[PDB]
């Protein structure tokens, strides 16, 4: 074990304008040809996806792409206003690989139900890593990679009711977020989900709750209050901020047989006064553009907190993006070789 | 879009009138409304205004105290409460919001002029006190 | 609050001449905000300069908006019959954002 410099290694090509492509080549670099994956003889790996400090090389460096690329018309820090630039930006993250230099080499659990925290038997060992998209969100964790057997629940300490807990599901569902054109506040969006397809999800999500809080009773409530990054889901859209209302999502009436089955239609916004994911401190953009704006992304995980006799009642959370990169880089460590 | 008002109302020395502000599209999110009005003969007088960006709503010493400006939930109508009215309120109140918000996006002008820059006005809320 | 005395009263100038009004403001304000306003006696002020020197949504080019500090002034290269009104000028950095006392251009004859 241990933790050296991983560097970027970028999938980009030379000559598009998206912004995801002008950074990786300055800070990302080629990817490794054929990827070494020999499987690992006899051997009992102990992984934390919580200290690994893959999450802090790309925390670290995704900052890097919002401020070389997302630079606000005004940033109120404490004290300072500062102001500079707004120019309008296509928007589309690419996967980023972190390979590791040479004298180290990346163990990566191939266990199926292994939680996040404790030993893994299949342990192999690679170059790089699976494509990880740079998706910025709260509560919902977007075009990100499915579970490969079950529901697994990911929480760095249970009883630690204000630490997120993490839920990475084994099949996906869609979510399609739109702001139509002339069909009107150009602020005002929607996102259309599968009624269906989610609320078997979440009964699936709520049965396996169960076997982690002694065969209880659930409880999906909405978030109290505070800033609506948290209490709503928040995501870009191709360089337009949407804040989109989940008490639809969240609705313990329907995980019986009743009117659920349509079409979940969230009432979104477009707001250009957010605050700052990087530190403390507001932001200001500029209005939207012309035209449709789309997103059809994958809900492949949840992001969920905990209040804490019987019944537990979660709440969805998130809001430190570090644990965003969590629900990606669980399976992976950093060792040495010499 | 244009920025609908309140009829002109008659009042009485002592009541309170409240004028509305509606808007045709959008919201007063970014940078909100200010209020505004004219005596008889006279010029134009700040009464208050949202800036939302602070998140503050202020007013002026003249009209402290009983004036009070809100909005929606949305931001969509915002009003002005005048308490304890009197003849040197008699005047025509004014509405003016930001003509950046919505519309779209222009290449074109600055967006880094977070105050409310006031060219989208009302019609004229013409009021009476009188006895 | 900040005193803006405009200046003068009435301006007598007659179409094609120049119009040069001045608003001085009793302490500084931050150049970038100080906005010019257009009313004509029958219906609604509107904006015609932002920021000092940025012109409002449409407004003609012949209306010249400048200055910084404390001395402002709002150019008009050539009068028309569309512009003999009065003329505020409002200082809205620092609350409370006052207004001028007024500027009427009259016509000459």
């Known amino acids: 074990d241990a933790d050296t410099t991983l560097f970027c290694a970028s999938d980009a090509k030379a000559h598009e304008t998206e912004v995801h492509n002008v950074w990786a080549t300055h800070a990302c670099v080629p990817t490794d040809p054929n990827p070494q994956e020999i499987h690992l003889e006899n051997v009992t790996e102990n992984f934390n996806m919580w200290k690994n400090n893959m999450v802090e090389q790309m925390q670290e460096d995704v900052i890097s792409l919002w401020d070389q690329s997302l630079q606000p018309c005004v940033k109120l820090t404490g004290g300072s206003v500062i102001k500079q630039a707004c120019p309008k930006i296509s928007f589309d993250p690419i996967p980023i690989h972190y390979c590791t230099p040479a004298g180290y080499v990346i163990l990566k659990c191939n266990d199926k139900n292994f939680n996040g925290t404790g030993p893994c038997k299949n342990v192999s060992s690679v170059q790089c890593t699976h494509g990880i998209k740079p998706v910025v969100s709260t509560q919902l964790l977007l075009n990100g990679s499915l579970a490969e057997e079950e529901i697994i629940i990911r929480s760095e300490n249970l009883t630690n009711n204000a630490k997120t807990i993490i839920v990475h599901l084994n099949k996906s569902v869609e979510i399609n977020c739109t702001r139509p054109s002339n069909g009107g506040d150009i602020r005002k969006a929607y996102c259309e989900i599968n009624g269906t397809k989610w609320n078997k999800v979440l009964k699936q999500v709520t049965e396996k709750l169960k076997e982690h809080f002694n065969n209880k009773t659930i409880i999906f409530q909405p978030p109290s209050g505070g800033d609506l990054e948290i209490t709503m889901h928040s995501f870009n859209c191709r360089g337009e901020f949407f804040y989109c209302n989940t008490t639809q999502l969240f609705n313990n009436t329907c995980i019986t047989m009743k009117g659920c089955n349509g079409t979940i239609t969230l009432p979104c916004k477009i707001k250009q006064i957010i605050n700052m994911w990087q530190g403390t401190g507001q932001a200001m953009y500029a209005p939207p553009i012309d035209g449709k704006i789309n997103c059809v992304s994958n809900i492949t995980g949840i992001l969920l907190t905990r209040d804490g006799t019987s019944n537990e009642t979660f709440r969805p959370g998130g809001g430190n993006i570090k644990d965003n990169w969590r629900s990606e880089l669980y399976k992976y460590k950093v060792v040495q070789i010499e | 879009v244009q920025l609908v008002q309140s009829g002109a109302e008659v009042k009485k020395p002592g009541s309170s009138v409240k004028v509305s502000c509606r808007a045709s599209?959008?919201?007063?999110?970014?940078?909100?409304i200010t209020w505004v009005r004219q005596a008889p003969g006279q010029g134009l007088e700040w009464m208050g205004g949202?800036?939302?960006?602070?998140?503050?709503?202020n007013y002026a010493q003249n009209f402290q105290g009983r004036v009070a400006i809100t909005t929606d939930a949305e931001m969509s109508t915002a009003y002005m409460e005048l308490r304890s009215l009197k003849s040197e309120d008699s005047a025509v109140y004014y509405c003016?919001?930001?003509?950046?918000?919505?519309?779209?996006?222009?290449?074109?002008?600055?967006?880094?002029?977070?105050?409310?820059?006031?060219?989208?006005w009302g019609q004229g809320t013409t009021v009476t006190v009188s006895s | 609050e900040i005193v803006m005395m405009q200046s003068p009263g009435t301006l007598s100038l007659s179409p094609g001449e120049r119009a040069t009004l001045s608003c001085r403001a009793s302490?500084?304000?931050?150049?970038?905000?100080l906005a010019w306003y257009q009313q004509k006696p029958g219906q609604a002020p509107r904006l015609l300069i932002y920021?000092?020197?940025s012109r409002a949504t449409g407004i003609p080019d012949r209306f010249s908006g400048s200055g910084s500090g404390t001395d402002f002034t709002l150019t008009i290269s050539r009068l028309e019959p569309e512009d003999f009104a009065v003329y505020y000028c409002?200082?809205?950095?620092?609350?409370?954002?006052?207004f001028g006392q007024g500027t009427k251009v009259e016509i000459k004859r």
């Open positions: 003016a919001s930001d003509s950046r918000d919505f519309s779209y996006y222009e290449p074109g002008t600055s967006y880094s002029h977070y105050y409310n820059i006031m060219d989208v």
């Open positions: 599209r959008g919201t007063f999110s970014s940078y909100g």
């Open positions: 949202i800036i939302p960006i602070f998140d503050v709503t």
């Open positions: 302490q500084s304000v931050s150049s970038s905000y």
């Open positions: 920021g000092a020197s």
């Open positions: 409002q200082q809205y950095g620092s609350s409370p954002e006052t």
